Amino acid sequence: RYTTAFHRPATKNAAKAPKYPRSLKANRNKMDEFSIIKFPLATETALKKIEDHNTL
RNA sequence: AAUAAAAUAUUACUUUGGAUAGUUUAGUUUCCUGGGCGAUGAAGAACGCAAUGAAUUGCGAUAAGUGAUAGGAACAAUAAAAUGUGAAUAUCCAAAAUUUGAAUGCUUGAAAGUAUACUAAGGUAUAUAUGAUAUUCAAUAUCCA
């Protein structure tokens, strides 16, 4: 057979097909635009940057 | 020989101290009933959440609370808003339940992360051992054309 090493023969490999759902969690993303941003920083340091550097 | 400044003694008042007396939402022991946790993710740990919170209590991105069912007019340190079209308060109920932890895709030091598949971001499944069934294979191991 021109080689010595014996390996495990490859067989058929079906994909996972569960008979019932594994989770029933609601498909709602809890990290949206309204949750990512809490509030702007209102310190005197953060106000100076908004004018000269045009940064929020 | 003399002095009463210091010293000593008694009592009253005050002071430092916290004994004594009065008291108990705390313990100790015995007895009765149960002895009801977890891969449907437990016990434990960590982080976060109150209009003003540091601890503690309760809770989990629906946060000192949501729905439902009872319940009947409060809470308060200070404001506010809501409230008999239902405030407090109660629960073996419903939804929801962050990071971990047997911890279970791989890694984990105080480590930030990251692979594939299914349904960019999100969410699920994939550790080890094991029983049944299905399917694909390996070995002339026994026959065997």
Q: Which residues touch strand B (CB under 7 A)?
A: A 9, 11-12, 15-16, 21-27, 29-31
**A50: which residues sit within 8 A by CB, 6+ positions away?**
A56
Q: What is the DSSP string of A28-56?
A: --S--HHHH------SHHHHHHHHHS---
A40, A46 Cβ separation under 8 angstroms: yes
Cβ-contact A45, A53 below 8 angstroms: no
Experimentally, the structure was elucidated by: cryo-EM
A1 CB-side CA count, 13 A: 4
Expressed in Å, this structure's resolution amounts to 3.0
SS3 A34: helix
| CA A39 to C1' B62, whole Å | 21
Q: Are A56 and A40 contacting, i.e. CB atoms less than 8 angstroms apart?
A: yes
Q: Are A55 and A40 in contact (CB under 8 A)?
A: no
- DSSP 8-state class, residue A18: -
